């Protein structure tokens, strides 16, 4: 009898960038969701396809925990049927998405006085991503007709841009840590059940 490691997901030290989000697989454990029922003032606890109250009574084949960091005004983009920079070029959710999304402010943790340049996002891309797709390419984007030849210049841009988090920023431009819990059901013994 093993409890699920939700603490190691919510209480981590370093969170991945949005364009290289981190995925963890949770299986063969008893899911105690009280750690989510207590919480603290939290920016978002929105669930899709299932009620938060019934979680302690459903068995899932496996659970996916996806962790990353964005800014405040983009938190609304982590939801099915959304469009924008993050939705189209960084992280996309399916239309028939079952799972929960939790998001909370992290200004005291991910902000630096001179600017934090460790968190980056993709700005230029020629097409959207299929759901649950990751792109870690770092090649020069050709905006014009003349090929770039791997060097920046006119009509040739490095794709990734830096957030530059500062403590003097507005609430919408402050860092937010986002965890997406995705639930799956297939022909499996459903080793993630809960206390029932």
């Amino acid at each position, epitope marked *: 009898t093993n409890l699920c*490691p939700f603490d190691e997901v919510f209480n981590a030290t370093r969170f991945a960038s949005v364009y290289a989000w981190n995925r963890k697989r949770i299986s063969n454990c008893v899911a105690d969701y009280s750690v989510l029922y207590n919480f603290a003032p939290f920016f978002a606890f929105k669930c899709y396809g299932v009620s938060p109250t019934k979680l302690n009574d459903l068995c899932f084949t496996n659970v996916y925990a996806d962790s990353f960091v964005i800014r405040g005004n983009e938190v609304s983009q982590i939801a099915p049927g959304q469009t924008g920079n993050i939705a189209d070029y960084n992280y996309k959710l399916p239309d028939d998405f079952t799972g929960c999304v939790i998001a909370w402010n992290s200004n*005291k943790l991910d902000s630096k006085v001179g600017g934090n340049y460790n968190y980056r996002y993709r700005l230029f891309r020629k097409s959207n991503l299929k759901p649950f797709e990751r792109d870690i390419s770092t090649e020069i984007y050709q905006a014009g007709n003349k090929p770039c030849n791997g060097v920046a210049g006119v009509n040739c841009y490095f794709p990734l841009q830096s957030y530059g988090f500062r403590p003097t920023y507005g609430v919408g431009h402050q860092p937010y840590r986002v965890v997406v819990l995705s639930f799956e059901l297939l022909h499996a013994p459903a080793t993630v059940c809960g206390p029932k």
Partner: antibody, heavy 127, light 108 residues
């Protein structure tokens, strides 16, 4: 309530090996790892190693690599530390603690420290 | 490795005063990877502060922690007979290293 009990004091000779047990009770054993600390008589603290109670992965300090082995047993909810090639420099008090600095499942850093230390085992070596 | 230096070595203060202990580091350490422990004579150490600002369970509110970068501070507002012990500063950004230790004693 969280309780951690260690074995009694031990007197050894140089070159021999010492095994110290740490029995934990009052919490889910497999959700937390175990860390070991050493304190010389009248000196400061010194980290030794960390062991995961889930898969058995371990990380040891650079000073003790090759001399210390940490094992675990989940049926009896117990951890074991064995130190070999003992020297007079190694006479000290040894503490087992429940860890919240590195996770047991994925092995990544956490926000916390060492909570719920044991009472301490004095290992003294001399001829 | 990261070397943590505590200051000062010992403190001589009377009950009721305010205590301030400093931990400096050779390199920068994330504020979410610093901790403070307390050890009374003849016993085992106990966790006092984690995350450089938070408080462990069952800890009175007179203990506070602050700082960032390479300077961290542990403050006690009102001292008591039970708050005269040895204090330690720990980090686990790169590997794990303990501080030298600072001691508080009665003045007379």
């Amino acid at each position: 309530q969280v309780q951690l009990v260690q074995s009694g004091a031990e007197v050894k000779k140089p070159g021999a090996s010492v095994k110290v047990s740490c029995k934990a009770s009052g919490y889910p054993f497999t959700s937390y790892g175990i860390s070991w600390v050493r304190q010389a008589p009248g000196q400061g603290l010194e980290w030794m190693g960390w062991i995961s109670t889930y898969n058995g992965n371990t990380n040891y300090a650079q000073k003790f690599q090759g001399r210390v082995t940490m094992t675990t047993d989940t049926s009896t909810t117990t951890g074991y530390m064995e130190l070999r090639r003992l020297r007079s420099d190694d006479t000290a008090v040894y503490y087992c603690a429940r860890d919240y600095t590195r996770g047991a499942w994925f092995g990544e850093s956490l926000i916390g420290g060492f909570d719920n230390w044991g009472q301490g085992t004095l290992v003294t070596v001399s001829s | 490795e990261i070397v943590l230096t505590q200051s000062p070595g010992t403190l001589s203060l009377s009950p009721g005063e305010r205590a301030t202990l400093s931990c400096r580091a050779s390199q920068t350490v994330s504020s979410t990877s610093l901790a403070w422990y307390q050890q009374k004579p003849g016993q085992a150490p106990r966790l006092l502060i984690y995350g450089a600002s938070s408080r462990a369970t069952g800890i009175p509110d007179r203990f506070s922690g602050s700082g960032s970068g390479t300077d961290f501070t542990l403050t006690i507002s009102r001292l008591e007979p039970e708050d005269f012990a040895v204090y330690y500063c720990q980090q686990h950004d790169t590997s794990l290293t303990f501080g030298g230790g600072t001691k508080v004693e009665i003045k007379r």
